[PDB]
Amino acid sequence: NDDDNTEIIKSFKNFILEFRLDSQFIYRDQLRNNILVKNYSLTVNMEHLIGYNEDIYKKLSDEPSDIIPLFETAITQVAKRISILSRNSLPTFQLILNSNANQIPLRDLDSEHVSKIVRLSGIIISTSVLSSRATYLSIMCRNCRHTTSITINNFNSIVSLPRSCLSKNCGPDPYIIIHESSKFIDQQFLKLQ
């Protein structure tokens, strides 16, 4: 799966680097301007992604929860390329999509559209307080003190601490989270009516 993931990452990287409408590389300029003001994101329009290479859009719209983290990785790599002098510690960039697809009524979201990308309208009636979802999860083995790391994508498929000492038995669940070395992001729950 490494080869396909790398191919997808490289394809969307080339989309970031090469796309331009008329004399201006829209997404290179947007990425640089976003980095300058410490806005680690990239608002990617969907018509542009369709026009560039419709195969990429097909791959994205097929399994969004598996492709979008790859696109965020590609955005991060492009950001390092165009904002860091070769020879880090740059957060994984966030992909913000803009679409003009037909709006699906909120009551029409049924068994189909599950795991699909849907565009819909409503009125917010509640906003939760900010939570904290971990992205970098520094972790240490309880018995043998085998410190490692876990990286979280936050796009739930449909991950947990390893159930192994992963390098005497150390038990079934030998891992405790090191909270002074982890990195978190804020998450908010809405409620659409």
Phi, psi of 48 (to 5 degrees): -65, -45
Phi, psi of 113 (to 5 degrees): 80, -5
**Segment interacting with Zn ion, rule: CB under 5 A, options 14-22, 27-35, 91-99, 172-180:** 172-180
- Which candidate, 124, 120, 100, 97, places its Cα nearest to that of 108? 120
**Segment interacting with another protein, rule: CB under 8 A, options 53-61, 69-77, 104-112, 160-168:** 160-168
43 binds another protein (CB under 8 A): yes
Contacts of 19 (CB under 8 A, 6+ apart): 25, 26, 27, 48, 52
Instruction: Using the minimum distance from each CB to another protein, give the nearer residue, 82 or 104.
Output: 82
The mark string for 107-146 relative to Zn ion (x by CB under 5 A, - otherwise) is ----------------------------------x-xx-x
Contact yes or no for 77/70 (Cβ under 8 A): no
Instruction: Using the minimum distance from each CB to another protein, give the nearer residue, 84 or 109.
Output: 84
From the list 187, 190, 191, 192, which residue makes contact with another protein (rule: CB under 8 A)? 187
148 binds another protein (CB under 8 A): no
Contact yes or no for 90/72 (Cβ under 8 A): no
Phi, psi of 186 (to 5 degrees): -90, 140
Q: E strand or H helix at 17, and its extent?
A: helix 2-18
Contacts to another protein by CB under 8 A? 17-18, 20, 23-26, 28-30, 32-34, 36-39, 43, 45, 48, 82-87, 98, 127, 129-134, 137, 140, 142, 156-161, 163, 176-180, 182, 184-187
